[PDB]
């Protein structure tokens, strides 16, 4: 369950938020934000690697 797992699971939240936004469902604008913030943070962290 390394850093790669959070790279994928953070993408699952973004894609589900995109699904909700496109299908005009109710609470999808929050999952996009949270998942993309997590994705940006994880990509920032991963820059500190060999």
């Amino acid at each position: 369950f390394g850093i790669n797992t959070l790279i994928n699971w953070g993408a699952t939240v973004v894609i589900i938020g995109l699904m909700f936004k496109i299908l005009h469902l109710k609470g999808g604008e929050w999952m996009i934000g949270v998942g993309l913030a997590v994705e940006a943070l994880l990509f920032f962290i991963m820059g500190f690697m060999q």
Binding site: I7, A11, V14, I15, K21, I22, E39, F43
Partner: protein, 211 residues
């Protein structure tokens, strides 16, 4: 195993696709249809106002000094007929474009094939019906201005749009040309009808205001 660039791409291509999908909406065509409906209703109101003007003038000062009102009433009726020529032309064009629309779609609210981008360019640019319509618009604007020459008709105008990106467009290529959906073209014809009715109201008001 994948390079960091490949993880970036393989994650962000779905986010980019979501962004692109969100950024394109059918609501443009829904907006065009709703604007057409509102323009039609406001044109009905304007026609009612013109009729009320005619009834008011007919038994407010026509009954007092007909020797002064008969030329004014005749000029107003002439302006009405001049505008009605363009109104009938636009009505013919609207029926033509709606007939080739493809049958009304009840689920959407307007004609099928409302986003064809080629029916209007095939019936108005190829056969030049748009050029004839533009000539009628210009002729009726000029003839309306002849009756007054004082007030300015900022509604009836087939002016070409200002060029952008080096290229230049004509009025017919801008209103009914390429890239214009069929619903946008029907809305443009309804706009031309509304502009004609507004110009008729303005000229009738001015003519009746001369006395």
């Amino acid at each position: 195993k994948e390079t960091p660039r490949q993880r970036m791409i393989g994650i962000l291509y779905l986010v980019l696709l979501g962004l692109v999908a969100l950024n394109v909406s059918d609501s443009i065509l829904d907006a065009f249809k709703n604007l057409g409906n509102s323009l039609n209703t406001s044109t009905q109101n304007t026609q009612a106002g013109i009729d009320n003007m005619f009834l008011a003038f007919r038994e407010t000062k026509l009954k007092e000094n007909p020797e002064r009102a008969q030329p004014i009433l005749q000029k107003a009726e002439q302006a009405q007929a001049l505008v009605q020529q363009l109104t009938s032309k636009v009505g013919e064009l609207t029926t033509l474009l709606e007939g080739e629309g493809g049958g009304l779609d009840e689920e959407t609210g307007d004609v099928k094939y409302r986003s064809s981008t080629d029916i209007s360019a095939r019936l108005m640019i190829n056969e030049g019906r748009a050029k004839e319509l533009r000539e009628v618009i210009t002729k009726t604007k000029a003839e309306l201005l002849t009756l007054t020459n004082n007030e300015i008709n900022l509604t009836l105008e087939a002016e070409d749009p200002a060029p952008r990106g080096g290229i230049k467009k004509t009025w017919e290529q801008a209103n009914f040309g390429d890239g214009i959906p069929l619903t946008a073209a029907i809305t443009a014809l309804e706009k031309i009808n509304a502009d004609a009715k507004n110009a008729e109201s303005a000229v009738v008001k001015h003519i009746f205001g001369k006395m």
